[PDB]
Amino acid sequence: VSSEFYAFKDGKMWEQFAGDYNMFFGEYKPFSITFVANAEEPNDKIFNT
Amino acid sequence: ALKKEQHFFKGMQRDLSVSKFNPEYAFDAQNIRITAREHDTLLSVSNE
Amino acid sequence: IAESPSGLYFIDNETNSLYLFNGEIVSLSDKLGFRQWISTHNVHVNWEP
Numbered sequence: 001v002s003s004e005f006y007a008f009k010d011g012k013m014w015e016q017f018a019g020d021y022n023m024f025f026g027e028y029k030p031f032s033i034t035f036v037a038n039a040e041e042p043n044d045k046i047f048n049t
Numbered sequence: 050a051l052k053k054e055q056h057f058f059k060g061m062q063r064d065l066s067v068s069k070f071n072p073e074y075a076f077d078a079q080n081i082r083i084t085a086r087e088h089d090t091l092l093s094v095s096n097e
Numbered sequence: 098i099a100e101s102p103s104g105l106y107f108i109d110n111e112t113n114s115l116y117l118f119n120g121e122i123v124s125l126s127d128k129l130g131f132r133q134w135i136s137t138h139n140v141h142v143n144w145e146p
Contacts, residue, residue, distance in 0.1 A: 002111070002141060003110050003111050003113070003139055003141060017086070017087070021096045021097070022080065022096055022097065029079075029080060030079065030080070031078075031079055031080035031081055031096055031097065032077075032078065032079045032080075032081075033058065033075050033077075033078045033079075033081055033094055034075060034076045034077040034078065035056055035058070035072070035074070035075045035076055036067050036070035036076050037054065037056070038067060038068060038069075038070055038072075039052075039054035039072070040052070041068050041069075045052075046050075048050045049050075084132075085130075085132055085133050086132075086133070086136070087133065087136070087137070088133060089133055091130065091132075
């Protein structure tokens, strides 16, 4: 709507990208990032740090 | 120790074998943004 | 909007970009890295002296 992106859930309109971080619809949801660590994959590695 | 490996985050990729995944991609990510929004956080993982 | 030999430089507030039309639309803000500067300086009120 205009220059702002809006949402609608549970009977209410939620303006996005305007509140505090990681709070979706009043509830805290986590964030995570998974990335494979495969360098020199023919060799058996011990992941140390 | 003996060796190191740097990993960059250019997006997220799936459907590829773990043995042949690429370090510049992430296998899975929840509530992250790799684009500069509200700050100069382009190509850098940031909160949503 | 500024007319030039190369095209038409216009700033779209809705999309938060600085475009250039030369037959094909090109987002100069994204190409040269100015998305945040424009996304933080946009408003709905039209220009007036």
